[PDB]
């Protein structure tokens, strides 16, 4: 043979609150100091947009790409290594 | 531990141009290097009479002859002792950071990274390489906790090869620059001991603050030193 309600009423309790877009995007990279603007990309980026599906067939992206062009070691390499460590599927090319 | 030795496209380090067109390597592989040191190839009379003085000593069969003279006052190391020694210190001595040299370090990683943020208008790897360089320096002496002397010793063999290959202090650095780009034209050919005479006796600037001046214009093609240094020459705004 091959094999391939407590955590639900504390997701609803904390997004009661008007600052959980701030709070949820400082938690991601905590060691990295600021760059508030880049760790808020991120997040939209994993919970991912909507799949638009027509009648006819044509479907639409609902994907976010980042792209990152600066200074070398500028909170861009270590930055990677967290993400990689917090989605759930993820390949490090 | 890679100890590599590159070679200038150019068969040699043209100081006229920027330090990164004349090496054909990335920006990824000079950020991996802890120390890139740059060996100048000067003509100088002075140094080209005790470096000839070397070699003719060494091929006139002095060489054996100055071993056994040296080896009794203590002052050279045989290879034999030297291979014992670098083993022996490799797993038993285990240095780490004193929190006194860490705020040293700290302190003194911001100035010299705000000495080159005024001059564009240094990454995370470049502090960690003064760490290893620090913890290699209490190795030697058999010490366990770094002390604040071997800061000072690791700095200055990062100045010396990072920062040579790219409150009253600084009001007189901006000043001397103004003063230079409106007293001297734009390929103006002036020698160094005219310039000399002229902000040194004239109680006005000081000597350390001269030869900062003049290095800090030459990286961004604008200062061209000729004839050793003697002649000032401008080149570029």
């Given at each position: 043979?091959?094999?391939?309600?407590?955590?639900?009423?504390?997701?609803n309790?904390?997004s009661?609150?008007?600052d959980?877009f701030?709070?949820?995007?400082?938690?991601?990279?905590?060691?990295?100091?600021?760059?508030?603007?880049?760790?808020?990309?991120i997040?939209?980026?994993?919970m991912?947009?909507?799949?638009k599906?027509?009648?006819?067939?044509?479907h639409?992206?609902?994907?976010?790409?980042?792209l990152?062009?600066?200074?070398?070691?500028?909170?861009?390499?270590q930055?990677?290594?967290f993400?990689?460590?917090?989605?759930?599927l993820?390949?490090?090319? | 531990?890679?100890?590599?030795?590159?070679?200038?496209?150019?068969?040699?380090?043209?100081?006229?141009?920027?330090?990164?067109?004349?090496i054909?390597?990335?920006?990824?592989?000079?950020?991996?290097?802890?120390?890139?040191?740059?060996?100048?190839?000067d003509?100088?009379?002075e140094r080209?009479?005790?470096?000839?003085?070397?070699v003719?000593n060494?091929?006139?069969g002095?060489?054996?002859?100055?071993?056994?003279?040296?080896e009794?006052?203590?002052?050279?190391?045989?290879?034999?002792?030297?291979?014992?020694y670098?083993?022996?210190?490799?797993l038993?001595c285990?240095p780490?950071?004193?929190?006194?040299?860490?705020?040293?370090?700290?302190?003194n990683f911001?100035?010299?990274?705000?000495?080159?943020?005024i001059?564009?208008?240094?990454?995370?790897?470049?502090?960690?390489?003064?760490?290893?360089?620090?913890?290699?320096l209490?190795?030697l002496?058999?010490?366990?906790?770094?002390?604040?002397?071997?800061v000072?010793e690791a700095?200055?063999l990062?100045?010396?090869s990072?920062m040579?290959a790219?409150?009253?202090?600084?009001?007189?650095?901006?000043?001397?620059?103004?003063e230079?780009?409106?007293?001297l034209?734009?390929?103006?050919?002036?020698?160094?001991?005219?310039?000399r005479?002229?902000?040194?006796?004239?109680?006005?600037?000081?000597?350390?603050?001269?030869?900062?001046?003049?290095?800090?214009?030459?990286?961004?093609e604008?200062?061209?030193?000729?004839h050793?240094?003697?002649?000032?020459?401008?080149?570029?705004?």
């Open positions: 043979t091959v094999y391939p309600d407590f955590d639900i009423r504390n997701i309790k904390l009661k609150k008007k959980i701030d709070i949820l995007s400082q938690s991601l990279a905590p060691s990295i100091y600021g760059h508030d603007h880049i760790k808020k990309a997040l939209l980026m994993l991912g947009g909507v799949e599906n027509l009648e006819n067939g044509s639409l992206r609902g994907d976010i790409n980042i990152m062009v600066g200074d070398p070691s500028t909170a861009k390499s930055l990677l290594r993400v990689l460590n917090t989605a759930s993820a390949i490090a090319t | 531990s890679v100890l590599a030795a590159a070679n200038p496209i150019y068969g040699r380090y043209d100081d006229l141009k920027s330090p990164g067109d004349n054909d390597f990335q920006t990824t592989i000079l950020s991996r290097f802890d120390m890139i040191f740059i060996v100048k190839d003509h100088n009379e080209d009479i005790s470096i000839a003085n070397h003719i060494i091929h006139t002095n060489a054996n002859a100055m071993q056994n003279q040296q009794e006052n203590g002052s050279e190391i045989s290879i034999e002792k030297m291979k014992r670098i083993t022996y210190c490799r038993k285990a780490r950071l004193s929190p006194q040299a860490a705020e040293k370090l700290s302190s911001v100035t010299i990274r705000k000495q080159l943020l001059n564009e208008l240094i990454t995370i790897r470049q502090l960690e390489a003064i760490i290893r360089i620090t913890e290699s209490a190795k002496e058999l010490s366990p906790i770094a002390q604040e002397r071997h000072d700095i200055r990062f100045q010396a990072t040579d790219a409150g009253t202090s600084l009001s007189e650095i901006r000043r001397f620059e103004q230079l780009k409106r007293r034209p734009i390929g103006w050919s002036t020698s160094y001991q005219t310039l005479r002229e902000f040194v006796d004239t109680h006005r600037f000081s000597q350390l603050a001269l030869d900062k001046a003049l290095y800090a214009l030459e990286k961004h604008t200062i061209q030193l000729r050793q240094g003697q002649n000032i020459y401008r080149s570029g705004v």
